[PDB]
Amino acid sequence: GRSTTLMRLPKRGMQGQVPGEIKRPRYQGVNLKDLARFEGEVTPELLVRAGLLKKGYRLKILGEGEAKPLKVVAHAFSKSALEKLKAAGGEPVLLEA
Amino acid sequence: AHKKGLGSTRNGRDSQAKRLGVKRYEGQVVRAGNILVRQRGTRFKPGKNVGMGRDFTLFALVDGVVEFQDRGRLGRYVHVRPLA
Amino acid sequence: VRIKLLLECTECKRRNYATEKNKRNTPNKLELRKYCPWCRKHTVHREVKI
Amino acid sequence: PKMKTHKGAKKRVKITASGKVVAMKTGKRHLNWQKSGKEIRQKGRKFVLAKPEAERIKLLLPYE
RNA sequence: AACCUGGGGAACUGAAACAUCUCAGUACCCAGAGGAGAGGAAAGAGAAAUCGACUCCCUGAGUAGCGGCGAGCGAAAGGGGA
RNA sequence: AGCCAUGGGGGAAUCUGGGCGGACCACCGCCUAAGGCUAAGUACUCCGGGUGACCGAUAGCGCACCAGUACCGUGAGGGAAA
RNA sequence: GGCGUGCCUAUUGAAGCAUGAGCCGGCGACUCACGGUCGUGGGCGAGCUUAAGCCGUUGAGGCGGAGGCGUAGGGAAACCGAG
RNA sequence: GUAAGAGGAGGUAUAGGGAGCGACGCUUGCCCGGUGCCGGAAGGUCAAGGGGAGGGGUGCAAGCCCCGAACCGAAGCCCCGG
RNA sequence: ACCGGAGCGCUGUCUCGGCGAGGGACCCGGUGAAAUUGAACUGGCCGUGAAGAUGCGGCCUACCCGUGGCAGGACGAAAAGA
RNA sequence: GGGCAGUUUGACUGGGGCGGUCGCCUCCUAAAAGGUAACGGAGGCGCCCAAAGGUCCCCUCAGGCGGGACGGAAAUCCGCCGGAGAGCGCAAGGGUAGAAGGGGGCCUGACUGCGAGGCCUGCAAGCCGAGCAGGGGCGAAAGCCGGGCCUAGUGAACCGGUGGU
């Protein structure tokens, strides 16, 4: 009968408009303990062709685990992720350049 | 049946009575922050390592044991022995 | 309550806030007294608006 | 066919990664003036529980 | 007999009541065209210097939103086929 | 609060005219309106065939049988029994 | 001769002077489709599975990874990230 | 009746529509406060419209779009009496 | 042929009823239905119990089936309380 | 603008109307914790205060009797006995001088960022508070200060105004 516990209030922020919403690229997280298990190099399509991404717009390197030498193909980078690629690992960026 | 007059009233009212009294008795352990007495007046004045606040409440200040006390010319008291 | 009115206090040099109350009947004009700002340190605060 | 998923439901509350429905404290839009900053500070967030289970059934399809 | 294009078109009921909202542009009224209809050569799309007639199925997605921000209502681009 | 179409009034340009990318503008891209036609992919089931972990004469089309027939009703209509 | 207040429904409570049944016969009431949430019998399992449809079959399967769920979450957001 | 028109009426104020009571006889008093109603070339207030002071946004800028002031703005209610 | 009060005549309206007539009702031949129906081997009293009993206790009464006839009851049937 | 249409036109209630009532505070019923009903018994809130708030130095009332210009049971003070019976903003109850009261000085913590652990509890609400950082007010300090002796003085959400990032 009461406010069907509807008395809780919204704070979803911005939460909608009418020109739709912004497509603006998002990032997929990757944990570089999934690195050590994989081998060779890494690339965007390679993860979407894997089982660990698929069309998540772009890719942010991150995560914990064991750092092992190879190269990636990264779209975004955590400070921590830069560090395991300081153990002995490479990385590119943004592409189309 | 004759239902003529009938003297009404203006009385029936009470209170969403909150539950007040000695919340934690003696021999009881507290982790500090546990209130031992919810009272209206000061029927229980602070004890050793027990504090009081705006609503006259004896609560815990440490991790020990509630100890009861009386002092005729000073009032009744509730304390918390250390337990080091 | 209203007609006795309620007011917020505002700093100087632009912004800084709190949430208090007033009273008119006592010959009170510019309600002015100390507080603290979000940024920086102790300041006055002048009576303002709704 | 197909659940409708409630808009308000998602619009004000979230179930954290534990099947725990958590969001908003009630009561601040008309409060104020005689309000101690103590509670405005405690008007930060909340938690909710129990009937929030049914609330987990509400959102359904996307979860969120 | 049904299905189809158009011009008209509700109410119960849903919102636990009722007006906005709803059922629903469904029921019916009519007009007209046929093994079909209508549609159909972008004064479009959408953001990539990417697209390339219209329609149907899957998809996206119950997503983007619309909303006494209630009941609930529910898109297009893109991808796959025809 | 645009785009799409339109009821009253106001009322133009032919490529430095222009419509549009969601108020509005600078800019940057996109498209050529204010004339008319176009198979297929889809839909329907009166109908012809096949098929069914479909029914068995209170079930199954309302009716297997002499049914849109008896009968009822002013009429619209209802509507068997065997 | 020892004993014994029909049935159902409906009740605080029925044998009831509450309720429905003249008798028998046939019919007659917890389905399904989709989306959920949980438990379970399974296959795989850091992954798992395809929708429409192409090909085939006459009671024959296969092909089809487009798409879904899974891997990180936190914030309203930009954005950061086991924080 | 959406209209065209139909009646009223091929009638024309001694006529047609509406209201009250109800043959004939004696008689129908007093209050306009509210309300309805008849009226008034002032006025209070109020719509779209008109006008454009002052201004915003934007762009090199020309320019384009938006906000709206003074006063001008009807019936309506109020107002003056019956 | 509307609603009060009065009187006069008249009278089975009454005292207060008695008789008679026919058509039914009754018996015989022919035809022969309805609503209702939980099942019936269905008595009073005094108690009881959802407060109003054939049925339960207690007592008493009662040879088995009808026909004419009488309506106290079976909370009588009829109307899912106006 | 009832000429016409869709709708609304509460709820409890010793049957309904009628009247009372609808929430919040205190005391009884309330049965030695908690809690508790009833159209049961008695009353209150919809406010207030910039000092009524924080602190530091400081004073102690009511009352009764004894003495007195006005005064006069009662304004005023003198003195003696008097421990809470006065004031404690406003109803009630608890509480109160070993102060909450009453005087002055100073001030504005009627802070911000939080907040362990609790009271209470169908949810949602409400209620308790050390502590920690900031940067302050009082006091030499010790220290308290995140309003008020305590419990009434109140209103989820949606809507939108407001200054601002």
Tab-separated table of N, CA and C (backbone and C1' of nucleotides) in Angstrom, chain C residues 11-13 15-16 34-45, chain J residues 109 111 134-137:
chain	number	residue	atom	x	y	z
C	11	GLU	N	30.861	32.203	3.138
C	11	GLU	CA	32.182	32.742	3.475
C	11	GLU	C	32.419	34.189	3.010
C	12	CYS	N	33.494	34.349	2.247
C	12	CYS	CA	33.924	35.593	1.639
C	12	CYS	C	34.770	35.098	0.477
C	13	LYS	N	35.442	36.002	-0.237
C	13	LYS	CA	36.372	35.643	-1.327
C	13	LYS	C	35.891	34.537	-2.288
C	15	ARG	N	32.455	31.646	-1.886
C	15	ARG	CA	31.982	30.319	-1.468
C	15	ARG	C	32.658	29.698	-0.231
C	16	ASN	N	32.014	28.628	0.264
C	16	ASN	CA	32.256	27.881	1.523
C	16	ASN	C	30.993	27.964	2.395
C	34	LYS	N	31.935	33.398	13.193
C	34	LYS	CA	32.957	32.459	12.706
C	34	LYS	C	32.497	31.053	12.291
C	35	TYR	N	33.365	30.379	11.533
C	35	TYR	CA	33.173	28.997	11.088
C	35	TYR	C	34.469	28.511	10.431
C	36	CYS	N	34.366	27.475	9.607
C	36	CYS	CA	35.507	26.959	8.866
C	36	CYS	C	35.119	26.702	7.412
C	37	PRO	N	36.056	26.948	6.488
C	37	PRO	CA	35.852	26.675	5.063
C	37	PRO	C	36.265	25.263	4.663
C	38	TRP	N	35.746	24.798	3.530
C	38	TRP	CA	36.142	23.511	2.975
C	38	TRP	C	37.618	23.601	2.634
C	39	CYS	N	37.953	24.594	1.821
C	39	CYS	CA	39.331	24.864	1.455
C	39	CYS	C	39.870	25.974	2.346
C	40	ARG	N	41.105	25.804	2.820
C	40	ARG	CA	41.798	26.760	3.699
C	40	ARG	C	41.404	26.673	5.179
C	41	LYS	N	41.380	27.826	5.851
C	41	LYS	CA	41.206	27.887	7.306
C	41	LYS	C	40.225	28.964	7.755
C	42	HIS	N	40.003	29.027	9.068
C	42	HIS	CA	39.000	29.889	9.710
C	42	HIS	C	38.675	31.239	9.046
C	43	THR	N	37.376	31.497	8.899
C	43	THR	CA	36.857	32.718	8.280
C	43	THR	C	35.541	33.140	8.950
C	44	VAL	N	34.987	34.273	8.528
C	44	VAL	CA	33.769	34.807	9.143
C	44	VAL	C	32.503	34.047	8.738
C	45	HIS	N	31.908	34.454	7.611
C	45	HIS	CA	30.642	33.959	7.026
C	45	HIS	C	29.471	34.929	7.247
J	109	G	P	32.629	27.393	15.778
J	109	G	O5'	31.518	26.254	15.748
J	109	G	C5'	31.868	24.902	15.497
J	109	G	C4'	31.323	23.981	16.560
J	109	G	C3'	31.300	24.561	17.971
J	109	G	O3'	30.238	23.957	18.712
J	109	G	C1'	32.768	22.709	17.907
J	111	C	P	27.332	23.664	13.670
J	111	C	O5'	28.716	22.968	14.034
J	111	C	C5'	29.258	21.945	13.212
J	111	C	C4'	30.440	22.454	12.431
J	111	C	C3'	31.064	21.490	11.435
J	111	C	O3'	30.343	21.404	10.215
J	111	C	C1'	32.765	22.524	12.699
J	134	G	P	46.549	16.896	12.434
J	134	G	O5'	45.621	17.899	11.613
J	134	G	C5'	45.836	18.148	10.230
J	134	G	C4'	44.632	18.806	9.598
J	134	G	C3'	44.358	20.248	10.014
J	134	G	O3'	45.104	21.182	9.244
J	134	G	C1'	42.343	18.965	10.084
J	135	G	P	46.362	21.971	9.868
J	135	G	O5'	45.714	23.259	10.543
J	135	G	C5'	44.998	24.206	9.766
J	135	G	C4'	43.693	24.579	10.423
J	135	G	C3'	43.784	25.314	11.752
J	135	G	O3'	44.052	26.700	11.598
J	135	G	C1'	42.151	23.601	11.893
J	136	G	P	44.698	27.557	12.799
J	136	G	O5'	43.794	27.211	14.069
J	136	G	C5'	43.172	28.229	14.845
J	136	G	C4'	41.701	27.951	15.048
J	136	G	C3'	41.085	28.438	16.356
J	136	G	O3'	40.724	29.810	16.317
J	136	G	C1'	40.374	26.214	15.888
J	137	G	P	41.026	30.777	17.567
J	137	G	O5'	39.965	30.352	18.677
J	137	G	C5'	38.727	31.034	18.788
J	137	G	C4'	37.935	30.587	19.992
J	137	G	C3'	38.634	30.625	21.343
J	137	G	O3'	38.733	31.933	21.888
J	137	G	C1'	37.388	28.620	21.138
